Design an enzyme around this catalytic site. Structure first.
Site, PDB file in Angstrom:
ATOM      1  N   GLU A  80      64.039   1.412  28.644  1.00 23.80           N
ATOM      2  CA  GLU A  80      63.145   1.072  30.000  1.00 23.80           C
ATOM      3  C   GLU A  80      61.599   0.733  29.238  1.00 23.80           C
ATOM      4  O   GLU A  80      61.107   0.760  28.291  1.00 23.80           O
ATOM      5  CB  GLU A  80      62.988   2.394  30.574  1.00 23.80           C
ATOM      6  CG  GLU A  80      62.055   2.242  32.108  1.00 23.80           C
ATOM      7  CD  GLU A  80      62.316   1.196  32.877  1.00 23.80           C
ATOM      8  OE1 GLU A  80      61.523   0.286  32.907  1.00 23.80           O
ATOM      9  OE2 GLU A  80      63.690   1.048  33.379  1.00 23.80           O
TER      10      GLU A  80
ATOM     11  N   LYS B 215      63.880  -2.153  21.926  1.00 23.68           N
ATOM     12  CA  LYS B 215      62.771  -1.315  22.766  1.00 23.68           C
ATOM     13  C   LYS B 215      61.793  -0.847  21.534  1.00 23.68           C
ATOM     14  O   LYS B 215      60.587  -0.645  21.910  1.00 23.68           O
ATOM     15  CB  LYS B 215      63.570  -0.140  23.265  1.00 23.68           C
ATOM     16  CG  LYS B 215      62.668   0.841  23.569  1.00 23.68           C
ATOM     17  CD  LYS B 215      61.552   0.648  24.657  1.00 23.68           C
ATOM     18  CE  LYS B 215      60.739   1.564  24.889  1.00 23.68           C
ATOM     19  NZ  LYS B 215      59.580   0.999  25.885  1.00 23.68           N
TER      20      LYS B 215
ATOM     21  N   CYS C 161      54.708   7.626  24.129  1.00 22.39           N
ATOM     22  CA  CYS C 161      55.632   6.678  23.374  1.00 22.39           C
ATOM     23  C   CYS C 161      55.358   5.703  22.472  1.00 22.39           C
ATOM     24  O   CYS C 161      56.040   5.567  21.318  1.00 22.39           O
ATOM     25  CB  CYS C 161      56.554   5.877  24.367  1.00 22.39           C
ATOM     26  SG  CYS C 161      57.450   6.548  25.552  1.00 22.39           S
TER      27      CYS C 161
HETATM   28  N1  LIG Z   1      57.251   8.013  30.150  1.00 21.92           N
HETATM   29  C1  LIG Z   1      57.350   6.748  30.084  1.00 21.92           C
HETATM   30  O1  LIG Z   1      56.360   5.876  30.177  1.00 21.92           O
HETATM   31  C2  LIG Z   1      58.463   5.716  29.242  1.00 21.92           C
HETATM   32  C3  LIG Z   1      59.550   6.715  28.543  1.00 21.92           C
HETATM   33  N2  LIG Z   1      60.727   6.083  28.072  1.00 21.92           N
HETATM   34  C4  LIG Z   1      61.605   7.088  27.634  1.00 21.92           C
HETATM   35  O2  LIG Z   1      62.346   7.791  28.516  1.00 21.92           O
HETATM   36  C5  LIG Z   1      62.669   9.249  28.019  1.00 21.92           C
HETATM   37  C6  LIG Z   1      62.085  10.170  29.139  1.00 21.92           C
HETATM   38  O3  LIG Z   1      60.749   9.909  29.222  1.00 21.92           O
HETATM   39  P1  LIG Z   1      59.805  10.823  30.091  1.00 21.92           P
HETATM   40  O4  LIG Z   1      60.469  10.972  31.385  1.00 21.92           O
HETATM   41  O5  LIG Z   1      58.445  10.560  29.811  1.00 21.92           O
HETATM   42  O6  LIG Z   1      60.087  12.412  29.562  1.00 21.92           O
HETATM   43  P2  LIG Z   1      59.678  13.855  30.346  1.00 21.92           P
HETATM   44  O7  LIG Z   1      59.617  15.071  29.511  1.00 21.92           O
HETATM   45  O8  LIG Z   1      58.809  13.791  31.366  1.00 21.92           O
HETATM   46  O9  LIG Z   1      60.965  13.756  31.284  1.00 21.92           O
HETATM   47  C7  LIG Z   1      62.395  14.438  30.695  1.00 21.92           C
HETATM   48  C8  LIG Z   1      63.108  15.376  31.387  1.00 21.92           C
HETATM   49  O10 LIG Z   1      64.262  15.860  30.978  1.00 21.92           O
HETATM   50  C9  LIG Z   1      64.448  17.150  31.266  1.00 21.92           C
HETATM   51  N3  LIG Z   1      65.718  17.324  30.198  1.00 21.92           N
HETATM   52  C10 LIG Z   1      65.534  17.930  28.815  1.00 21.92           C
HETATM   53  N4  LIG Z   1      66.709  18.317  28.193  1.00 21.92           N
HETATM   54  C11 LIG Z   1      67.600  18.252  29.440  1.00 21.92           C
HETATM   55  C12 LIG Z   1      68.869  18.480  29.554  1.00 21.92           C
HETATM   56  N5  LIG Z   1      69.767  18.717  28.532  1.00 21.92           N
HETATM   57  N6  LIG Z   1      69.421  18.111  30.864  1.00 21.92           N
HETATM   58  C13 LIG Z   1      68.621  17.791  31.762  1.00 21.92           C
HETATM   59  N7  LIG Z   1      67.462  17.535  31.939  1.00 21.92           N
HETATM   60  C14 LIG Z   1      66.927  17.789  30.623  1.00 21.92           C
HETATM   61  C15 LIG Z   1      63.143  17.809  30.678  1.00 21.92           C
HETATM   62  O11 LIG Z   1      63.092  19.072  31.197  1.00 21.92           O
HETATM   63  C16 LIG Z   1      62.369  16.850  31.576  1.00 21.92           C
HETATM   64  O12 LIG Z   1      61.850  17.152  33.020  1.00 21.92           O
HETATM   65  C17 LIG Z   1      62.129   9.250  26.598  1.00 21.92           C
HETATM   66  O13 LIG Z   1      63.214   8.897  25.601  1.00 21.92           O
HETATM   67  C18 LIG Z   1      60.735   8.387  26.647  1.00 21.92           C
HETATM   68  O14 LIG Z   1      60.475   7.974  25.286  1.00 21.92           O
HETATM   69  C19 LIG Z   1      61.035   4.932  28.086  1.00 21.92           C
HETATM   70  C20 LIG Z   1      60.131   4.086  28.860  1.00 21.92           C
HETATM   71  C21 LIG Z   1      58.836   4.701  29.612  1.00 21.92           C
HETATM   72  O1  LIG Z   2      44.759  -3.278  25.813  1.00 19.84           O
HETATM   73  C1  LIG Z   2      45.084  -2.134  26.076  1.00 19.84           C
HETATM   74  C2  LIG Z   2      46.149  -1.779  26.531  1.00 19.84           C
HETATM   75  C3  LIG Z   2      46.343  -0.213  26.531  1.00 19.84           C
HETATM   76  N1  LIG Z   2      45.730   0.517  25.855  1.00 19.84           N
HETATM   77  C4  LIG Z   2      45.943   1.775  25.860  1.00 19.84           C
HETATM   78  O2  LIG Z   2      47.114   2.010  25.299  1.00 19.84           O
HETATM   79  C5  LIG Z   2      47.949   3.253  25.699  1.00 19.84           C
HETATM   80  C6  LIG Z   2      49.171   2.656  26.460  1.00 19.84           C
HETATM   81  O3  LIG Z   2      49.071   1.973  27.343  1.00 19.84           O
HETATM   82  P1  LIG Z   2      50.372   1.436  28.147  1.00 19.84           P
HETATM   83  O4  LIG Z   2      51.008   0.426  27.287  1.00 19.84           O
HETATM   84  O5  LIG Z   2      49.825   0.530  29.396  1.00 19.84           O
HETATM   85  O6  LIG Z   2      51.037   2.583  29.143  1.00 19.84           O
HETATM   86  P2  LIG Z   2      52.407   3.199  28.445  1.00 19.84           P
HETATM   87  O7  LIG Z   2      52.536   4.294  29.628  1.00 19.84           O
HETATM   88  O8  LIG Z   2      52.237   3.914  27.249  1.00 19.84           O
HETATM   89  O9  LIG Z   2      53.531   2.073  28.600  1.00 19.84           O
HETATM   90  C7  LIG Z   2      53.959   1.543  27.100  1.00 19.84           C
HETATM   91  O10 LIG Z   2      54.990   2.661  26.888  1.00 19.84           O
HETATM   92  C8  LIG Z   2      56.083   2.601  27.652  1.00 19.84           C
HETATM   93  C9  LIG Z   2      57.091   3.778  27.104  1.00 19.84           C
HETATM   94  O11 LIG Z   2      57.757   3.034  25.953  1.00 19.84           O
HETATM   95  C10 LIG Z   2      56.871   1.210  27.628  1.00 19.84           C
HETATM   96  O12 LIG Z   2      57.745   1.354  28.738  1.00 19.84           O
HETATM   97  C11 LIG Z   2      55.609   0.174  28.133  1.00 19.84           C
HETATM   98  O13 LIG Z   2      56.291  -1.039  28.192  1.00 19.84           O
HETATM   99  C12 LIG Z   2      54.589   0.287  27.277  1.00 19.84           C
HETATM  100  O14 LIG Z   2      53.456  -0.522  27.839  1.00 19.84           O
HETATM  101  C13 LIG Z   2      47.150   3.804  26.826  1.00 19.84           C
HETATM  102  O15 LIG Z   2      46.425   4.864  26.191  1.00 19.84           O
HETATM  103  C14 LIG Z   2      46.272   2.383  27.253  1.00 19.84           C
HETATM  104  O16 LIG Z   2      44.687   3.043  27.743  1.00 19.84           O
HETATM  105  C15 LIG Z   2      44.569   0.024  25.388  1.00 19.84           C
HETATM  106  O17 LIG Z   2      43.943   0.655  24.793  1.00 19.84           O
HETATM  107  N2  LIG Z   2      44.193  -1.292  25.358  1.00 19.84           N
END
Ligand SMILES: NC(=O)C1=CN([C@@H]2O[C@H](COP(=O)(O)OP(=O)(O)OC[C@H]3O[C@@H](n4cnc5c(N)ncnc54)[C@H](O)[C@@H]3O)[C@@H](O)[C@H]2O)C=CC1
Ligand SMILES: O=c1ccn([C@@H]2O[C@H](COP(=O)(O)OP(=O)(O)O[C@H]3O[C@H](CO)[C@@H](O)[C@H](O)[C@H]3O)[C@@H](O)[C@H]2O)c(=O)[nH]1
Ligand SMILES: NC(=O)C1=CN([C@@H]2O[C@H](COP(=O)(O)OP(=O)(O)OC[C@H]3O[C@@H](n4cnc5c(N)ncnc54)[C@H](O)[C@@H]3O)[C@@H](O)[C@H]2O)C=CC1
Ligand SMILES: NC(=O)C1=CN([C@@H]2O[C@H](COP(=O)(O)OP(=O)(O)OC[C@H]3O[C@@H](n4cnc5c(N)ncnc54)[C@H](O)[C@@H]3O)[C@@H](O)[C@H]2O)C=CC1
Ligand SMILES: O=c1ccn([C@@H]2O[C@H](COP(=O)(O)OP(=O)(O)O[C@H]3O[C@H](CO)[C@@H](O)[C@H](O)[C@H]3O)[C@@H](O)[C@H]2O)c(=O)[nH]1
Ligand SMILES: O=c1ccn([C@@H]2O[C@H](COP(=O)(O)OP(=O)(O)O[C@H]3O[C@H](CO)[C@@H](O)[C@H](O)[C@H]3O)[C@@H](O)[C@H]2O)c(=O)[nH]1
Lengths: 459, 456, 459
Positions: free
Chosen positions: C161, C220, C276
């Site tokens: 994602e 990723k 992340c």
């Molecule tokens: N938060 C973000 O901006 C992004 C995160 N990711 C990846 O997506 C994944 C999830 O991230 P978040 O949603 O932020 O984490 P989160 O901690 O907010 O959500 C994960 C959920 O899974 C639940 N969970 C844990 N073990 C479980 C199990 N055995 N069965 C069912 N549910 C279970 C947890 O209780 C929690 O509610 C990670 O690998 C993260 O690195 C990728 C892109 C965007």
């Molecule tokens: O020019 C910039 C851009 C971002 N940030 C900071 O960097 C961090 C990350 O920000 P941002 O990348 O926008 O948000 P995330 O939720 O961490 O999203 C990142 O992490 C996700 C989890 O992997 C990926 O899916 C996204 O593509 C990637 O942008 C934050 O604390 C921002 O304030 C800066 O300081 N300067």
């Protein structure tokens, strides 16, 4: 199928003795030893062999001209042979990637390519040179890329375990023979043909067969273990000097434990010889490549201890000579890396000498077997012309010297007349025994007036 | 001078066996073993001794005739010609040299107690493993507390027995080592101690040295032994990277008679009360004598042993999909070596601590180790949340992996057919002892995934 | 020719909730069930108050939930009925064991795989959306193969994602690309094609990329490392601007007009936060070590070390400017979320700045328009918090009696505060530390008012 003609590439300390022994034990096999070095081959065809090994002359003489031959005609000797030994040198690289660490394989590869250039039919090609693990696979790949119709080259590993100075005894009665080859029908058949050769004088129970890489690794492992025992007791020897203990008494007490054994526990100014350092380094270099940094630093300690043991001894000499040896005459007794050889490769006497030369000492070097010209070469790269004298007998080396430094354990040094020597040395007169050969004479020497020091004994 | 009355302080592994053997072999020499602990002395006079094969027979052969065990330390000292010091010398767990240096407080206590209770001439022999030069400290205490006619001679007589074979090692030792002053008084004492051992040890096998050589030989011997294990274990890591087999390599290495073929059995890492403790003492000593090169040389023996355990633990974690949290893992084998129940510095402890830190559920089985000693060794609970002490088949009920850490023979003859069906899949087996050599084809066949030190 | 009609997502967090919500919004004929072991979270998803704040999320959830979108704690039943199963659970950095502080904790991923296989029959597709280490998918394959059942056919796909928090709905509805990884087996391609057809309802096919599992997982990790590195690069320039008298905003503009560099992600800041970026660079670092690439490891490590320096540097500048002591000084912290438009504080720089000032004994009043109070308390706890931390209801209460105002999150409202009003009630001299550059263009007014204003990347 049975091996009837053997060609050996490399007429050195391995090529000559091993082939001489094979010829002597297998009258029906023709054994031809070849080399690019014409002066070395000529000397093998002379009353004065190019190396000194006890009993080698008698073995060579018994078979030369009958079924043992020494030649620079590499090509014909390969075409004729059923078996080709590769026994060329594998020194540490002194250049480029892995300088000071990695094995230099250029002589091996030149062999492999001359073999496939000159071969037809069926031949067993046997790597006796100490090589990195997986090196036999390199030979296999060169052969597979340069195939001809009806050409069938099999690659074996056959590491050599002789020690110089006892080569003939070692080759006639080896602790074991080790042979590696493929697990394929052709590989096993080739292994068996080489077994049959050794089985003319070695019992089958002493012949170990394995795969190629296990074989190459055993050779490196065995040398590193042997080097480790020396460095271990040499490290104990430093502890002995600091505490009042004696490393000979400690080596005796430890060696009487049968799980430890009593061999290779003779403290020294440091191990020499062409293969101990380069083979441990090869093992260290391999560890790096395989992401084993812990294994690499474990075996590196065997080399660092040995270097420390040498630098320690040179400092003692300088520090006991009132911290200046500039212009002082110092006798170096023994230049060979051990007794009963004329070989100086990596001898501790080279390193002690160079340390003393860096301080401006006037060295007088005596060795009963090492040729005059080889000492000059080893201490070259002049400093040599200004500071180095090669003596024809031990008494002229000690004449007017400040210090006598025994570096090689030649039997004769125990028996010298040290009253004659003391009388004409400068005072005070020192003896540094780097080999523990003067144990039991310390009290006599002390009465004569020498200040005598030795490894592993508190001063 | 003739030794006719012997007292030995410390009725431990070293103390009693050695003195029992002395009394058995020396019928007209009076041997009294004394100790701080009464409960232990009463067990030495009881049917159940506090176990070595053949010991019960040697004890009851001459107890009450020339062998006694009293709690009466001061009278044993008073009329004895020879005093053995055989007290535990634990590592310091505090202060300068923490965890490495030896704690000499029990020897010091013995020295002061001996000098308080002695008149005339006595030979005082340190049997305990001590840092080099320790005898100088004992002499210092003696010389500082001198009284008229008091004349205490100090010798070193280290022991070399291995646990499990004590009576064989003592009736027929590879050597007896006796160090004393290279003075006329010292040689008197040495000869008197020799004459004791000469009742059953050939004079050829009795090595005499100066005091410091004798102390150092004990440390250096254990270090060489442990260096051999670490050297082959390091080779075992190479065999895995290169497709060699550490068993074949070790056979090839060990047939060189200058190397010998003993102590070349690769393992998860050496345990025992003394190998690590005595290399560490050696190292500590080097640091203090300003020999850093020597120190870092011998440190590699421990660093390699630590790395062999750590990398075994990583292999388990990495093969189990990089996480063992809340996974049941069976530990088959907790003692440091097979056919005994001693756990000191056992590799299982470290392997188990490595997996507890990940949160795995360890079910531990050992045929000889008490289940109260396992708990103690994994402690200082987190133990109660992660450690249940099992028979082996229930330790493997529903487990992801079986880890073999001690070479019990019974682990070869198990029904791995049965075990596999009641294990989660994929089922793993991690052999840290090479006890499953030859059975690998079957195990793969059973569907088991098998990994061992020095293969693949 | 196979249609996905029921979808289960395991993990109802910042990924699972939004992604499945947009899936349900853009494909009315698919039933999407989101599940989680967290009961208070799932119930929040089933309320008028969602468990997270994403702009636009409430509209999308409420327009679909109980139509084709569902949230449930009933993990097992959602799996059995599902054609496609997402794994969206958290993969935090390990705080224990081997690889502590570096390696990814996979305990929750595995529990999903094992719960799935225990609850699956027939055909399903299992897709890994969680950010996992390279070759993690392979591990799921081998748990599925080892626990087969008469008619199981679990295919394994990787589908990382790329949404960013704060802009998740916009990003999910208009992604720059979708990345799917799967086997080259025939059914590998069939399973990839199935998941493609779900995204093709609203994503152009030219924006869907297909590769294998391990390339997708690596893509990723590499993406986040590149993004994080741009932030650390401009932050390092921000330090150079301070020392040289250049403006980092002007320099970023000049740099960013080179179209090869691009003008995104060049906003200097107190430091990057979020769940992340750090944990994923570290994951990459931990992978390099295992693969014997220490050079690659220490190259990407710099991204982290520079981030930690930027934060430390910022805190040290606060402390230095306040006469080298902030013990007992009230200090206002404006902004606790890790960026604007989220209530999320995971790895927020506000935590680190706050802890640095708490270590000095400062009294902090923290304001954030979205982060709930309870969360702030947990973030700063492990009390030291009871004595030093107040969570304010409005920004002027945070600033009342403060020596300094520290802006850590770029909320739009902080540009609009009444700084005259704030200055009259602050202790003097009064400072503003702008760690986000939100007060640019207000510097002169702020100065005349009497503030000492300091910001990242300006002298
Ligand atoms: N938060 C973000 O901006 C992004 C995160 N990711 C990846 O997506 C994944 C999830 O991230 P978040 O949603 O932020 O984490 P989160 O901690 O907010 O959500 C994960 C959920 O899974 C639940 N969970 C844990 N073990 C479980 C199990 N055995 N069965 C069912 N549910 C279970 C947890 O209780 C929690 O509610 C990670 O690998 C993260 O690195 C990728 C892109 C965007
Ligand atoms: O020019 C910039 C851009 C971002 N940030 C900071 O960097 C961090 C990350 O920000 P941002 O990348 O926008 O948000 P995330 O939720 O961490 O999203 C990142 O992490 C996700 C989890 O992997 C990926 O899916 C996204 O593509 C990637 O942008 C934050 O604390 C921002 O304030 C800066 O300081 N300067
Ligand atoms: N010296 C020893 O005690 C032993 C050494 N070994 C190993 O055996 C090998 C040979 O060692 P040494 O005999 O001491 O070396 P060496 O240097 O004495 O002899 C090797 C010979 O090979 C010749 N040679 C090199 N390249 C050649 C080529 N392309 N064609 C023909 N001849 C060529 C050289 O001129 C030289 O005379 C090395 O791998 C060494 O590590 C193994 C056991 C014992
Ligand atoms: N365990 C082994 O295999 C061997 C150990 N050694 C060395 O021998 C020594 C003895 O070790 P173990 O016999 O295993 O220990 P242990 O703990 O079993 O024996 C020591 C005995 O001395 C007693 N003791 C301690 N201080 C005392 C004091 N001040 N007065 C009276 N009694 C006292 C203890 O209560 C105990 O009964 C150690 O230095 C060890 O390193 C040497 C060879 C082998
Ligand atoms: O107790 C000892 C034994 C040896 N050395 C020294 O160690 C070096 C090596 O001697 P040694 O092993 O006897 O001779 P090499 O000719 O180097 O033979 C070694 O190197 C060969 C080449 O690989 C192997 O085949 C042999 O098995 C192995 O013993 C020499 O400088 C010796 O003086 C000591 O100082 N103390
Ligand atoms: O090839 C081998 C041999 C042993 N070990 C291990 O090494 C350790 C040592 O075993 P062992 O030597 O039998 O144990 P100890 O009873 O501690 O005996 C050692 O420690 C005593 C105390 O100093 C000395 O007296 C002995 O000589 C010395 O063998 C054990 O954990 C073994 O499993 C191996 O891994 N590989």
């Amino acid at each position: 199928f049975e091996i009837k003609k053997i060609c050996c590439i490399g007429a050195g300390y391995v090529g000559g003795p091993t082939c001489s022994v094979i010829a002597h034990m297998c009258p029906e096999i023709r054994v031809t030893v070849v080399d690019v070095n014409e002066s070395r081959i000529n000397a093998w065809n002379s009353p004065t062999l190019p190396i000194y090994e006890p009993g080698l002359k008698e073995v060579v003489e018994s078979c030369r001209g009958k079924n043992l031959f020494f030649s620079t005609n590499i090509d014909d000797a390969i075409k004729e042979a059923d078996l080709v030994f590769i026994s060329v040198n594998t020194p540490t690289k002194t250049y480029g990637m892995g300088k000071g660490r990695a094995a230099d394989l250029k002589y091996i590869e030149a062999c492999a390519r001359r073999i496939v250039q000159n071969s037809n039919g069926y031949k067993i090609v046997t790597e006796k040179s100490t090589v990195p693990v997986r090196a036999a696979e390199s030979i296999r790949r060169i052969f597979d890329a340069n195939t001809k119709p009806n050409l069938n080259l099999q690659v074996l590993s056959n590491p050599e375990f002789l020690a110089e100075g006892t080569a003939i005894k070692d080759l006639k009665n080896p602790d074991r023979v080790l042979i590696g080859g493929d697990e394929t029908p052709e590989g096993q058949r080739a292994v068996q043909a080489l077994c049959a050769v050794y089985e003319h004088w070695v019992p089958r129970e002493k012949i170990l067969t394995t795969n190629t890489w296990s074989s190459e690794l055993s050779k490196l492992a065995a040398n590193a273990f042997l080097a480790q025992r020396i460095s271990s007791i040499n490290s104990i020897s430093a502890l002995c000097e600091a505490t009042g203990a004696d490393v000979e008494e400690v080596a005796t007490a430890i060696g009487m434990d049968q799980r430890i054994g009593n061999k290779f526990l003779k403290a020294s100014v440091g191990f020499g010889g062409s293969c101990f350092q380069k083979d441990v380094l090869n093992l260290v270099y391999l560890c790096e490549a395989l992401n084993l940094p812990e294994v690499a630093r474990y075996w590196q300690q065997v080399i660092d201890m040995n270097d420390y043991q040498r630098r320690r001894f040179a400092s003692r000499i300088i520090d006991s000579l009132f911290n200046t040896v500039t212009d002082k005459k110092i006798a170096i007794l023994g230049f060979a890396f051990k007794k009963d050889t004329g070989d100086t490769r990596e001898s501790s006497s080279i390193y002690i000498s160079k340390y003393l030369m860096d301080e401006g000492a006037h060295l007088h070097i005596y060795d009963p077997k090492v040729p005059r010209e080889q000492i000059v070469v080893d201490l070259s790269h002049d400093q040599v012309s200004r500071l180095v004298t090669i003596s024809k007998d031990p008494y002229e080396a000690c004449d007017g010297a400040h210090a006598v430094v025994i570096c090689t354990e030649w039997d004769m040094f125990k028996e010298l007349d040290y009253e004659r020597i003391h009388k004409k040395m400068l005072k005070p007169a020192f003896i540094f025994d780097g080999r523990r050969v003067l144990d039991g004479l310390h009290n006599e020497l002390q009465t004569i007036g020498f200040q005598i020091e030795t490894i592993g004994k508190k001063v």
